């Protein structure tokens, strides 16, 4: 049985300051054991009896205890449209994973015309594939991997 | 593509605008200095570099 605290990693609301009002916050979680656990041999944990269940997920929000008069001054400023907050993704990026066949040597790339205004470097590395699915549904029970991704 | 049109929207999204202490109200910039030691606002605002 486990107890863990899990942070928000999304680069638009992980450092945001949120003013008075009522909000609806929802975030979904993954119960696939090949995506939430790591293995030392990288052996599949869905051909083994690993499983997980969640019972109760709370949110803990920690409030700075403002003086009321100062709080409302702060709010008023940040209700102005000239004091809009502004964030950027740390790896500000667009990710394209082009397939490399087995025993291939050369890998052409086709990129349809775009504007290249305000572009920065290419950055690249070679992965490894054939096992586990991709992000979007995080399941597919014909699993074959569980090690470091 | 065409003739420039991305420049005003880089002064809006702070990709090539002016400094943070210079697009914010002087009241909020005074507040952010005064409270710096215990309630940092600095990371909430982009500063451009070109």
């Amino acid at each position: 049985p486990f107890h863990i605290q899990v942070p928000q990693k999304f680069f638009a609301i992980k450092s945001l300051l949120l003013l008075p009002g009522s909000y609806t916050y929802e975030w979904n979680f993954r119960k696939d054991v090949n995506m939430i656990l790591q293995s030392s041999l990288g052996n599949d944990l869905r051909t083994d009896g690993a499983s997980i269940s969640f019972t109760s997920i709370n949110l803990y929000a920690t409030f700075f205890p403002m003086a009321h008069n100062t709080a409302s001054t702060l709010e008023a400023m940040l209700r102005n449209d000239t004091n809009d907050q502004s964030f950027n993704d740390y790896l500000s990026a667009a990710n394209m994973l082009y397939p490399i066949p087995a025993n291939a040597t050369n890998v052409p790339i086709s990129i349809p015309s775009r504007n290249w205004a305000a572009f920065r470097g290419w950055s690249f590395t070679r992965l490894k594939t054939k096992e586990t699915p991709s992000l979007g549904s995080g399941f597919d029970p014909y699993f074959v991997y569980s090690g470091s991704i | 593509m065409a003739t420039p049109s991305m420049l005003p929207q880089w002064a809006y999204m702070h990709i090539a605008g002016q400094d943070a202490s210079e697009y914010l109200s002087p009241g909020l910039v005074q507040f952010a200095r005064a409270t710096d030691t215990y309630f940092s606002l600095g990371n909430k605002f982009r500063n451009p570099t070109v």
Binding site: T70, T73, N88, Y90, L91, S92, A93, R120, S123 | D19, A20, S21, L24, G27, V29, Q30, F31, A32, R33, A34, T35, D36, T37, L41, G42, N43, K44, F45, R46, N47, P48, T49
Partner: peptide
């Protein structure tokens, strides 16, 4: 350079008689 930047051209202005630089 994969990176961020923040409000930094302004500084903690406080005196050695108060840890808070006032606000009008």
């Amino acid at each position: 350079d994969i990176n961020f930047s923040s409000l930094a051209p302004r500084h903690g202005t406080r005196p050695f008689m108060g840890t808070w630089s006032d606000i009008g």
